[PDB]
């Protein structure tokens, strides 16, 4: 049916069959990534050709391959062998995570380190984390994971409360070798537990909370069609799901009268980096590229009706591939519902005697994922007035360390002896713009203050200025909250009734961007995170701000390489990459479990409509 | 029994009785402002002396007075006569607004202007606006209003769609004389109607919106006692209502185990200025001090159940005084309710096998007011985790003008020939801090980036710095979104278990502040609006950032004057004044009626608690 439909179990199995038939998926092969490709640029194009891209790992150590297959035609479109030391390692496999603790349990250097701290190896959990790229020449071309230890006293114990500082081990997950065990010194292992489910900690539970019942007597106002096609209050879109990116929104459009007007072709969080700012050798290499290295969609939670998603919910259970190419369903991994959103518009007019009040509501599409200690919710919102918004919700358990005796400039104390290294959670939203079609441009709009004098004798005048970003070389922009800087994406060939190019304005939160020194490994690997806004000329192979292979990959790919092409973006098929994140100095209130913190951005119509698009909203 | 209870109708009548009896409420006397006084600083107030402050205007031009009466004793504590040319005029009375149109209607110059435009005087509505202080020496000591004309074709017609540009009149509302009629030239009066209730404009109403019902089977979780005392999820506070400020929150405190710990002594929006940035002489004087000149509580709307406030609502119907001292109730002028706020905390732990999810909730206390064309919702939120938030929602009908032939650098076009002068809506939240009591201090916290090198060889380290504001002369701060600047209010004498002063962190939205030239009258009169954060030593007579008598004051009153005292604020009874607002370049989408736009700020506990305060929240 629709070329934007979710991948089905059958398609996944068929991709497996095709790879096998091609001799690309024997018993030592593992699917490190599998996702359906979006239809090529066409108004429908030459019939349906569902293509899937696959990253194939080889557990024997042979070179991996990147393969595109047409599940429709039963063919391999292309299959290229990868030189990982050059272009990057494939995403980490789940099975490789499990390897780390096991191998370390029998390494004598590790056992010696644990013995030095009087810790029973059977109780030492190991957080197997991405390695990144540092000064270890022996790691080039190899698949490494760095392990950090946490003591788990009993089964239901939260090990995060017990970091074993001063110790870190590097592990080759293919050759199954412990390459290095670093011990900088013994640190007391924080003893207080952080068992938020333990009555000893929680105390008696509140009996003061009365029920809040959110019901929809006649069912929701949106319709789901073709499995993932949503239609709600003039909006139209397809809810896609990729194992790397998670929920992806396709063909976001608004029915203005009789015409379905496109706004955003594709919206996704293309990368998510969580850099740590503790200069201790034990953690100074810690940088989670949750999307790029771990693949957030792979870890999407099954949402429970009641507490995860309240109200009348319609779920999607996306299917992904397991490491062997078999389809695996994430039951209720996506929540879809509409929620009341207060007042939309209100005016009590003295002169006419008319009092008008209308309520707002928003369509919500979300999913939650778990990356070890942290859990992140991705929420996309569509409002009646045409506003589009994304909201990331960060919760879970903060990553701990020991709190240094003489305090720390890069770690905060959460409990006695317990520290929490400073870090950030930075996202990159990739917005493949289609403001009334593909001919778009971006203007940076700043408020302009004026000097009191001729023509402004009372010094009350203030203006605004817009600068068209014409070439990619001049499209890497930074925020300026002080001048109320925003970016407008317009279609220079599509004017509203007032003869102005229709547009949408992007409102950023203006949070700090990547803090790391510009010469650091992380600044180069997460170069996108150093600037608030990037605009590129669309290209089918420019998908992530960090490139296709982030795992242990240096700089050289991603946005910085794309921008160098210096392509024309003035009234062309363009892509907006917005960097936005949280800078965290963990508080005691964040321990034992972090209350949700949020960050996001939104786009509001800017002369897109000919007047307010909510005049037809009923009293209700 | 509570000295924070809302004024009763009877108490208003009592003030009236007292005033007339003392011969202070004669036939020519008018009450321009009346409000109960907050209890003074007194640890154990046993003798309750309920006092009211009243601003008495004299329609005969005789000097007005500031009078303080004790409703308890039935006496006049004070009665001071005011030299308005020195200390500003009193707030405008509704009757004075009314007289403007009437007066102009018989003025030759006005009728001449209307005749030239072929406008029927009976159809011309006049927006009677505050005058400010400009170059008209003859206005000093006089009560002036400036009127702008709008054509109302019929009774249920929206006059805002038809501004009459090139025309403005100045009226002395006491002598009832038209002091000036300025006609800079004819401008076509915009012809299209903006009648958002007209099916011709709305088209057929949506039938797609299914109902979303929010109910509470067992009623609300908050208790209202003593008429306005709220207890909800460990929070404790008193909801007051003043005619100038509107909803005012008193004694915000959180029950941490045994102790009821104070956080904010008093929270209010102490001023809200809407300055216009159109240099045209027709509007270059336009600056609404909604709170100070118009009194926002006076115009509070009677909210409708199911319309303005959905769910299980508990209303307060505050009473205010009219111009003659008679009590007038604003039925259902305040909404109180708790609403679901999604996920509070969530973590699915692999190691313990424990999947934990908790819902968030916020207590909402709000009111809506109408200032002519615009309508503003003021919302205060209290969250389960101890977060306090304020949100202002701006709606209504934008103030119009003609859109100049050839465009404009200071006005945007909404409809054919219809203009919308650029302007801002800037608020001042006055937060009389009481973090664990009154001994407080404020620190400005900036993110600190570090250079790669010794101690930071991987260039990943990032820190933060805090600067204590010790004196008022260094307590006028600006935003720095770039460095993630925030301001922490702590009690240096109250420490948490980790031996650090308890605190709360104010997170500003970092919107632009007042854009007007620094030498402008509006910069001088609304100086508070030029900076994001101010900290002053508490003083009972320092209530408004703009001073007590804002109307036609020359400038420098309020904040800049208080700050000039240069008092000690390092560990003293202090008050935080946060400036925040929306910079508006009206869009076509804001016409004919503006969809809600928002601004706010919030404060989060910062080492205030010893661990998460929401560990006892039940699973539901
Ligand atoms: Cu964090
Ligand atoms: Cu506005």
UniProtKB/Swiss-Prot annotation, chains A, B:
UniProt keyword Disulfide bond, yes or no: yes
SUPFAM superfamilies named among the record's database cross-references: Amine oxidase catalytic domain, Amine oxidase N-terminal region
Keyword Nucleotide-binding: no
Induction: By phenethylamine.
InterPro entries per UniProt: AGAO-like_N2, Cu_Am_Ox_Cu-bd, Cu_Am_ox_TPQ-bd, Cu_amine_oxidase, Cu_amine_oxidase_C, Cu_amine_oxidase_C_sf, Cu_amine_oxidase_N-reg
Annotated cofactor note: Binds 1 copper ion per subunit.
Enzyme Commission code: 1.4.3.21
Modified how: Topaquinone (TPQ) is generated by copper-dependent autoxidation of a specific tyrosyl residue.
Active-site residue list: 290 (proton acceptor), 374 (schiff-base intermediate with substrate)
Gene Ontology process terms (BP): amine metabolic process
Cofactor(s) the protein requires to work: Cu cation; L-topaquinone
Biological role stated in the UniProt entry: Catalyzes the oxidative deamination of phenylethylamine to phenylacetaldehyde with the concomitant production of hydrogen peroxide and ammonia.
Family: Belongs to the copper/topaquinone oxidase family.
Protein name: Phenylethylamine oxidase
């Amino acid at each position: 049916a629709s070329p934007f439909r979710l991948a089905s179990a059958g398609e996944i199995s068929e991709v497996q069959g095709i790879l096998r038939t091609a001799g690309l998926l024997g018993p030592e092969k593992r699917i490190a990534y599998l996702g359906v490709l979006d239809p090529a640029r066409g108004a429908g194009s030459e019939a349906e050709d569902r293509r899937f891209r696959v990253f194939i790992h080889d557990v024997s150590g042979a070179r991996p391959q990147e393969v595109t297959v047409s599940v429709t035609n039963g063919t391999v479109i292309s299959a290229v062998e990868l030189d990982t030391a050059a272009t990057g390692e494939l995403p980490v496999l789940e099975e490789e995570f499990e390897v780390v603790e096991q191998l370390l349990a029998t390494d004598e250097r590790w056992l010696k380190a644990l013995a030095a701290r009087n810790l029973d190896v059977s109780k030492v959990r190991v957080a197997p984390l991405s390695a990144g790229v540092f000064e270890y020449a022996e790691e080039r071309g190899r698949r490494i994971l760095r392990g950090l230890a946490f003591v788990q006293d009993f089964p239901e114990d939260s090990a995060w409360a017990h970091p074993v500082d001063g110790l870190v081990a590097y592990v080759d997950v293919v050759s199954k070798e412990v390459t290095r065990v670093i011990d900088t010194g013994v640190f007391p292992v924080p003893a207080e537990h952080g068992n938020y489910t333990d009555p000893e900690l929680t105390g008696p539970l509140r009996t003061t909370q009365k029920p809040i019942s959110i019901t929809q007597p006649e069912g929701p106002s949106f319709t789901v069609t073709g499995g993932n096609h949503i239609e709600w209050e003039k909006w139209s879109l397809d809810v896609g799901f990729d194992v790397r990116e998670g929920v992806v929104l396709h063909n976001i459009a608004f029915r203005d009268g009789d015409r379905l007007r496109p706004i955003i072709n594709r919206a996704s969080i293309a990368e998510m980096v969580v850099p740590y700012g503790d200069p201790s050798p034990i953690r100074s290499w810690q940088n989670y590229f949750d999307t790029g290295e771990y693949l957030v969609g792979q870890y999407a939670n099954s949402l429970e009706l009641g507490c995860d998603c309240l109200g009348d919910i319609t779920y999607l259970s996306p299917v992904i591939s397991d490491a062997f190419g078999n389809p695996r369903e994430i039951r209720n991994g996506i929540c879809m519902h509409e929620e009341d959103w207060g007042i939309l518009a209100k005016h009590s007019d003295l002169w006419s005697g008319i009092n008008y009040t209308r309520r707002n509501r928003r369509m919500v599409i979300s999913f939650f994922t778990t990356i070890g200690n942290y859990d992140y919710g991705f929420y996309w919102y569509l409002y009646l007035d045409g506003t589009i918004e994304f909201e990331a919700k960060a919760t879970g358990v903060v990553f701990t360390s020991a709190f240094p005796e003489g305090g720390s400039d890069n770690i905060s104390q959460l409990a006695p002896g317990l520290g929490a290294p400073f870090h950030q959670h930075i996202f990159s939203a990739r917005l493949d713009m289609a403001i009334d079609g593909f001919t778009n441009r971006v203007e940076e709009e700043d408020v302009v203050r004026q000097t009191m004098g001729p023509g402004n004798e009372r010094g009350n005048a203030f203006s605004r200025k817009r600068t068209v970003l014409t070439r990619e070389s001049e499209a890497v922009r930074e925020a300026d909250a002080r001048t109320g800087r925003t970016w407008i994406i317009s279609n220079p060939e599509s004017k509203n009734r007032l003869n102005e190019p229709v547009g949408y304005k992007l409102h950023a939160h203006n949070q700090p961007t990547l803090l790391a020194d510009p010469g650091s490994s992380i600044a180069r690997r997460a170069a996108f995170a150093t600037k608030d806004l990037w605009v590129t000329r669309y290209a089918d192979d420019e998908r992530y701000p960090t490139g296709d292979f982030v795992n242990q990959h240096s700089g050289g790919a991603g946005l910085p390489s794309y921008i160098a092409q210096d392509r024309d973006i003035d009234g062309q098929d363009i892509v907006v990459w917005h960097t936005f994140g949280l800078t965290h100095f963990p508080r005691v209130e964040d321990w034992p479990i972090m209350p949700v913190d949020t960050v996001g951005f939104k786009l509001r119509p800017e002369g897109f409509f000919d007047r307010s698009p909510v005049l037809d909203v009923p009293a209700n």
